[PDB]
Ligand binder design. Sequence first.
Ligand SMILES: *[C@@H]1O[C@H](CO)[C@@H](O[C@@H]2O[C@H](CO)[C@@H](O)[C@H](O)[C@H]2NC(C)=O)[C@H](O)[C@H]1NC(C)=O
Ligand SMILES: *[C@@H]1O[C@H](CO)[C@@H](O[C@@H]2O[C@H](CO)[C@@H](O)[C@H](O)[C@H]2NC(C)=O)[C@H](O)[C@H]1NC(C)=O
Ligand SMILES: *[C@@H]1O[C@H](CO)[C@@H](O[C@@H]2O[C@H](CO)[C@@H](O)[C@H](O)[C@H]2NC(C)=O)[C@H](O)[C@H]1NC(C)=O
Ligand SMILES: *[C@@H]1O[C@H](CO)[C@@H](O[C@@H]2O[C@H](CO)[C@@H](O)[C@H](O)[C@H]2NC(C)=O)[C@H](O)[C@H]1NC(C)=O
Ligand SMILES: *[C@@H]1O[C@H](CO)[C@@H](O[C@@H]2O[C@H](CO)[C@@H](O)[C@H](O)[C@H]2NC(C)=O)[C@H](O)[C@H]1NC(C)=O
Ligand code: NAG
Ligand code: NAG
Ligand code: NAG
Ligand code: NAG
Ligand code: NAG
Ligand code: NAG
Lengths: 115, 222, 224, 49
Amino acid sequence: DAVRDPQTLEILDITPCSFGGVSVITPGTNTSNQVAVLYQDVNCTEVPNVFQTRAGCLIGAEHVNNSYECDIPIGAGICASYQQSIIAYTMSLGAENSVAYSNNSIAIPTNFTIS
Amino acid sequence: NQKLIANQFNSAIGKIQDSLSSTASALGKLQDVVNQNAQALNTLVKQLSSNFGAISSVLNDILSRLDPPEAEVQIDRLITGRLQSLQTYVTQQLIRAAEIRASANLAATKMSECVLGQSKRVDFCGKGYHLMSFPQSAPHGVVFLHVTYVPAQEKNFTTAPAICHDGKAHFPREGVFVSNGTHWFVTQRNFYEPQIITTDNTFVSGNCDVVIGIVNNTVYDP
Amino acid sequence: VTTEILPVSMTKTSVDCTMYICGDSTECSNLLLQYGSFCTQLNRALTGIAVEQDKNTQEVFAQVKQIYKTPPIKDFGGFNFSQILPDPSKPSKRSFIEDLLFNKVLICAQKFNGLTVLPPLLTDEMIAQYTSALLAGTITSGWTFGAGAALQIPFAMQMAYRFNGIGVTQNVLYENQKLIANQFNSAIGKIQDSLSSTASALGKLQDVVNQNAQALNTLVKQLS
Amino acid sequence: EIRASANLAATKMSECVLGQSKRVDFCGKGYHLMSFPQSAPHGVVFLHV
Ligand SMILES: *[C@@H]1O[C@H](CO)[C@@H](O[C@@H]2O[C@H](CO)[C@@H](O)[C@H](O)[C@H]2NC(C)=O)[C@H](O)[C@H]1NC(C)=O
Ligand SMILES: *[C@@H]1O[C@H](CO)[C@@H](O[C@@H]2O[C@H](CO)[C@@H](O)[C@H](O)[C@H]2NC(C)=O)[C@H](O)[C@H]1NC(C)=O
Ligand SMILES: *[C@@H]1O[C@H](CO)[C@@H](O[C@@H]2O[C@H](CO)[C@@H](O)[C@H](O)[C@H]2NC(C)=O)[C@H](O)[C@H]1NC(C)=O
Ligand SMILES: *[C@@H]1O[C@H](CO)[C@@H](O[C@@H]2O[C@H](CO)[C@@H](O)[C@H](O)[C@H]2NC(C)=O)[C@H](O)[C@H]1NC(C)=O
Ligand SMILES: *[C@@H]1O[C@H](CO)[C@@H](O[C@@H]2O[C@H](CO)[C@@H](O)[C@H](O)[C@H]2NC(C)=O)[C@H](O)[C@H]1NC(C)=O
Ligand SMILES: *[C@@H]1O[C@H](CO)[C@@H](O)[C@H](O)[C@H]1NC(C)=O
Ligand SMILES: *[C@@H]1O[C@H](CO)[C@@H](O)[C@H](O)[C@H]1NC(C)=O
Ligand SMILES: *[C@@H]1O[C@H](CO)[C@@H](O)[C@H](O)[C@H]1NC(C)=O
Ligand SMILES: *[C@@H]1O[C@H](CO)[C@@H](O)[C@H](O)[C@H]1NC(C)=O
Ligand SMILES: *[C@@H]1O[C@H](CO)[C@@H](O)[C@H](O)[C@H]1NC(C)=O
Ligand SMILES: *[C@@H]1O[C@H](CO)[C@@H](O)[C@H](O)[C@H]1NC(C)=O
């Protein structure tokens, strides 16, 4: 991981050239032939709608501020879906619900369903 | 509600019928098992086309060209590779079989506890309060139709842990105390059904100076 | 209060078979093709594991449909939850106890051989949100949130149901409500101190980490 | 092994957190009242009351 140069006695560090897996994000071909590509654990400055995330550099997916239920997982909280074009978003964990708690209030079902 | 319950049940069964007829992916858990084993066999068979360093993947071709002193060397390369490929297959099947065994044990447990009984284990026999279940046969598997009771329409009520009648603290025997804003009733917890509070549906223990949140009301004694 | 610790997931490693065996070598890579699909099925086996680890996490924590929240006024009949509920003063909305667990429980050298690590689908912040929702539900609706819509119920009444469940009448709770709240609050404090003090308390999770670290170090050293 | 542990953890979440268990020594030692999940590195911690 390091070498002393033979002409000038300089110490150099050696790192591998950037590499990583390449994953293709796609809706099925029944819907679209449009794809997005994830360069896993790679910087967006090393690879050559470019979104840098923890999982890697995601290219071809439009990043939006709207969360949705998870469709195609990317990793690190990011999912992608086809909605048309491919988009990337932080997945929602579900709708929020503040429970109307008080020391003297009880909810009681008045009906039921059979599921 | 017997007529309603029968209708809700019959409707829910019809929904299963349509869901299964429509959604191809519904049985993905069983199809995945089939696919994993199919891939394992296709991989095993395709390995027979590998040379593994030999002059040929075909044993007959090695033997048609070479005499034993040379053929054995080429054959040893195929044996090593084919034996290794077969060992890999078997190991994967033993691990995969263990997963299926665990699933089968779970299925057997559900059969006993969900079909041959009524479970009090939450989310074990479906999502909701388990009533009953019905097994159905499936390719290399079992499908359970879990019938559950689920609370529906909503209403808020005022409550209290106890009622102060004669200075004594009255607690509900089976349900909870509720109020509609003017009158107090006792009702079963999972279904609103208010009843007049009487000495027959409450019990008495201690006095009103200990219970936090106790309210004043009348307990009737027919 | 008893602490039970269980592994849920494993680090999602990914090993590139060709890179590992024949890193940056065309001559080696071609020889490796004589072994057929061995690399394809090894890459597949590890991929299957990685997928499973996200599934394991999802099945344990995503059991709640909605993200429930507690009210601004935490009046739970004398029962204190500040140790197990989130404290938003910091970027990660974890509880005090969770911070202790997290604080208690090389990668370049490994990575350089085609050994990458994939991030979990659910980040620590999302796991914390799920546990907060499960906890908020447990506290404000008891078990009803697990069988449908969450009912609201006073915490003391919820406890009364739980006492009935164990064969103890309701008045025992109410008559001793102050004592019970104190015993509970004290027991929680004991957990806080036990975790702060005993390093080995989370050995079950650390052991999983250690086994996987050894497996990778062994794999990498074999290249020598 | 991890899958088995995760399945156990998922079972406990449902039966110990989203309910009250009558299974002895399943949700702690004693008569189970309730439990609270806590997040942990690659795992879950249950506080069983
Ligand atoms: C409880 O809910 C059920 C539906 O799940 C109600 O039944 C429906 O009532 C409407 C009229 O408002 C009818 O048009 C539907 O056809 C009924 N459905 C079924 C399956 O019968 C029922 O009336 C509700 N009960 C109470 C007391 O509110
Ligand atoms: C609380 O419930 C009681 C009992 O049903 C209600 O009192 C009745 O009100 C009806 C009119 O809707 C009268 O015809 C009955 O004679 C009343 N019964 C009694 C015993 O007084 C009461 O109105 C409800 N309160 C609220 C706020 O809804
Ligand atoms: C419930 O009713 C009792 C009386 O039956 C109330 O008792 C009074 O409490 C006040 C405050 O300490 C005293 O000044 C009165 O002298 C008490 N009255 C009697 C007859 O002893 C009690 O406060 C009521 N509780 C609620 C919540 O309304
Ligand atoms: C709930 O418990 C927390 C501690 O877990 C209480 O906060 C502490 O209060 C004491 C004073 O009595 C301070 O010295 C500590 O530094 C506080 N600790 C923290 C983390 O803030 C809190 O007051 C209790 N809540 C209620 C309603 O009693
Ligand atoms: C039941 O046991 C509890 C302790 O677990 C008793 O509470 C303690 O009482 C002593 C006095 O003898 C106090 O000094 C302690 O501070 C109390 N501890 C707590 C947590 O409150 C309680 O008195 C006993 N009850 C009965 C009926 O014997
Ligand atoms: C040749 O190598 C020696 C190493 O001691 C170094 O001092 C010298 O400067 C080098 N000469 C050139 C032209 O690089
Ligand atoms: C897939 O394409 C076929 C046409 O070849 C169509 O009939 C079917 O409904 C499509 N399914 C989906 C989910 O798009
Ligand atoms: C990519 O490089 C930039 C510098 O141009 C740096 O600031 C950023 O943090 C790097 N991102 C990753 C994932 O390495
Ligand atoms: C999300 O909103 C912020 C402003 O709060 C903005 O700066 C950011 O660019 C937006 N991101 C996307 C993907 O729209
Ligand atoms: C109960 O009251 C709260 C307000 O505190 C309200 O938001 C909620 O919708 C009410 N629920 C029902 C069933 O009325
Ligand atoms: C119930 O909560 C209210 C605040 O919302 C408080 O004023 C009241 O005293 C509490 N009741 C009891 C019995 O503690």
